[PDB]
Ligand binder design. Structure first.
Ligand SMILES: *[C@](O)(CO)[C@@H]1CCCN1C(=O)[C@@H]1CCCN1C(=O)NCc1ccccc1
Length: 710
């Protein structure tokens, strides 16, 4: 099967760094430079062996044909109203990018408003962020090229879809918020830096500033409204209150769900927005999250995790601001996580809870917090919503493992609420009724019960014979909830597979305590939970080690890489997408400094001692047992991934190939693929999505010798 040679890769044996008395060698440190001829050559030499391996088997073509057919169904976002018009995104099925449409009423003819497909030949220019003026008459929108986090903001007049001259450069991790006077918009930008700013560069991102752009002016005239030059990692995002009176500034430092909250009453500005605003530092620490919901005069309703790991709603009066005086509007639930909250039709709140990793959607009274209405849902996720304070209706979008999902609509002006299906799409070719989704709770190493979803064909014998695809993330307070994936259902239907998703610690599935259970000194809990998930699938007879594939991306790419080093005997195949592999250096690059809230930072001795134990780059080791080799591994990354710089995967693959790939007992392939004109994955065009899943499943089919099932 290894009908190919690994490329020779130079080792810089002089690259030795002292970490708190521990010497670490980093012989592929030179791969950190994306622009060098050396690094370019390495990448070319790697893709040269990977592409033929993946494309040799007819199963890739069979999978791609099926994916192309089954993925070709219409995809809609919720309707949402702005000013006097409705908007929605729509993809006929296989367009590279979804298209923004406008209609003058709910039954009016729709027309194309913004079509990102015409911005490139290959669909690699995508929308990233947008903001309508309060009256709905002007529209600002971010564009990213090649999947980079860098954005250019452009502007349109809505009536006639007219392009405006205004262009904002150097935008990244940015808010977009228009003042209600329609004069201009808040956004964030970064100071000029040496070298490139296109998504191929690794330079750290510091000193983000908040600016106000006056419409019809050049960007050079933009007003600096907030900056934190003594705190280079702080990021201040602006939003206007629902009545337009206040700018709220949420300042973050890292990825924890906490923020400072300052405000500025715009009516108190001496002469409009002319420089740094008269900020009032209502919450001036990083001890809690304060997420604006709505206000009524000086009474501000926020969703918070302050003293409430499962979140709750509080009212803070700006004119009586001490914490002792805050009113608890909707108290914390004992187990259910309050995921998000919206205010609609003046005095309703829409609350979305997570209960054992399934959503429930509720309407509450703003004045008392009282429950009014439960919106009926099947078991799965709410993935989209519209309805702001001035609106008199909501839309919401539901999805699940087996259903592409449904957009619902509810007219909130009605005395008796009657939600109805507004849009529904069926994917013929996959009969949902042939399959089932079960949820189980398995005990981890320390006895903690972890949820896991399993999706499989009804009636199968649990005799260990099925290939399985087990997915995890485990970090950053992100909950991994049910969603429709045609590519995974093809694995079930046409490869006879079992799908599994493990809700391991580090996630937000059981609130901030679940998140803290998988970070910092307890990061090893994530890996233990995930390994235990694999043992459960095997023990209960869903699969066997040699038929089990694991998959994760980003922080989940770290998950599956670590699990390969720690338990190579447990897995047949590992696909790590855009993974954080160098845990000693991740903080040095682009936005990596933000992840130290989950991981820690190697500059501290204490953190170093945690990180060195699991950092995938630093834990590649030939298994001691003669009959154990590493699983088949595929790393996927891309040259404009400026979220997780691709050097992580480059250094990791060189290391795997040299330490393990050179040993006589290793017969499983250890491969990387580096895509071009693509990034971390946000805004990836449909054509690339299809190619990527075809690569992934062809790898699986080949490594496990799975027969296609027509
Ligand atoms: C990956 O897991 C998910 O994309 C990477 C690697 C570890 C964590 N991330 C990651 O992207 C984190 C987690 C989700 C958001 N995030 C960011 O880095 N976001 C950029 C950002 C924006 C504002 C403030 C801080 C960070």
């Amino acid at each position: 099967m290894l009908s190919f040679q690994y490329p020779d890769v130079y080792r810089d044996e002089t690259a030795i760094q002292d970490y708190h008395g521990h010497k670490v060698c980093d012989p592929y440190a030179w791969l950190e430079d994306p622009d060098s001829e050396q690094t370019k050559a390495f990448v070319e030499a790697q893709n040269k062996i990977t592409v033929p391996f993946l494309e040799q088997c007819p199963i890739r073509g069979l999978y791609k044909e099926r994916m192309t057919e089954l993925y070709d169904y219409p995809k809609y976002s919720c309707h949402f109203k702005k000013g006097k018009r409705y908007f929605y995104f729509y993809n006929t099925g296989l367009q590279n990018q979804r298209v923004l449409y406008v209609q003058d009423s709910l039954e009016g003819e729709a027309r194309v408003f913004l079509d990102p497909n015409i911005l490139s030949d290959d669909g690699t220019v995508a929308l990233r962020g947008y903001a309508f003026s309060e009256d709905g008459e002007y529209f600002a929108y971010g564009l990213s090229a090649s999947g980079s986090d860098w954005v250019t903001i452009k502007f349109m007049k809505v009536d006639g879809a007219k392009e405006l001259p205004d262009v904002l450069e150097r935008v990244k991790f940015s808010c977009m918020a228009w003042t209600h006077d329609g004069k201009g918009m808040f956004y964030n930008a970064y100071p000029q830096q040496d070298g490139k700013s296109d998504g191929t560069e690794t330079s750290t991102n510091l000193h983000q500033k908040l600016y106000y752009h006056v419409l019809g002016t050049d960007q050079s005239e933009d007003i600096l409204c907030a900056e934190f030059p003594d705190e280079p990692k702080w990021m201040g995002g602006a939003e206007l209150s629902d009545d337009g009176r206040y700018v709220l500034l949420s300042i973050r430092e890292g990825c924890d769900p906490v923020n400072r909250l300052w405000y500025c009453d715009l009516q108190q500005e001496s002469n409009g927005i002319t420089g740094i605003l008269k900020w009032v530092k209502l919450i001036d620490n990083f001890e809690g999250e304060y997420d604006y919901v709505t206000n009524e005069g000086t009474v501000f309703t926020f969703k918070t995790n302050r003293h409430s790991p499962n979140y709750r709603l509080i009212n803070i009066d700006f004119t009586d601001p001490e914490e002792s005086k805050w009113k608890v509007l909707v108290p914390e639930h004992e187990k259910d996580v309050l995921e998000w909250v919206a205010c609609v039709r003046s005095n309703f709140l829409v609350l979305c809870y997570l209960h054992d990793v399934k959503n429930t959607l509720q309407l509450h009274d703003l004045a008392t917090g009282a429950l009014l209405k439960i919106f009926p849902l099947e078991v799965g996720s709410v993935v989209g919503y519209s309805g702001q304070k001035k609106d008199t209706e909501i839309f919401y979008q539901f999805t699940s493992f087996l259903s592409p999902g449904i957009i619902y609509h509810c007219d909130l002006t009605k005395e008796e609420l009657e939600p109805r299906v507004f849009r529904e799409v069926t994917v013929k070719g996959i009969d949902a009724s042939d399959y089932q989704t079960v949820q189980i709770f398995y005990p981890s190493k320390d006895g903690t019960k972890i949820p896991m979803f399993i999706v499989h064909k009804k009636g199968i014998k649990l005799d260990g014979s099925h290939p399985a695809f087990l997915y995890g993330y485990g970090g950053f307070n992100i909950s991994i909830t049910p969603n429709y994936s045609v590519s995974r259902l093809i694995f079930v239907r046409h490869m006879g597979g079992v799908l599994a998703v493990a809700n391991i610690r580090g996630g937000g599935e059981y609130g901030e305590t679940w998140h803290k259970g998988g970070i910092l000194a307890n990061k090893q809990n994530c890996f233990d939970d995930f390994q235990c998930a694999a043992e459960y699938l095997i023990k209960e007879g869903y699969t066997s080690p040699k038929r089990l594939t694991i998959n994760g991306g980003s922080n989940g790419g770290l998950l599956v890489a670590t699990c390969a080093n720690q338990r190579p005997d447990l897995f047949g195949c590992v696909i790590a997408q855009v993974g954080v592999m160098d845990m000693l250096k991740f903080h040095k690059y682009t936005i990596g400094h933000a992840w130290t809230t989950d991981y820690g930072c190697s500059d501290s001795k204490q953190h170093f001692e945690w990180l060195i134990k699991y950092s995938p780059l630093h834990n590649v080791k030939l298994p001691e047992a003669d009959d154990i080799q590493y699983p088949s591994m595929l790393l996927l990354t891309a040259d404009h991934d400026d979220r997780v710089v691709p050097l992580h995967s480059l250094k990791f693959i060189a290391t795997l190939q040299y330490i393990v790939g050179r040993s006589r007992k290793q017969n499983n392939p250890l491969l990387i693929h580096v895509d071009t004109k693509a990034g971390h994955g946000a805004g990836k065009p449909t054509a690339k999505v299809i190619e990527e899943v075809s690569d992934m499943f062809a790898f699986i089919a080949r490594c496990l010798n799975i027969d296609w099932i027509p």
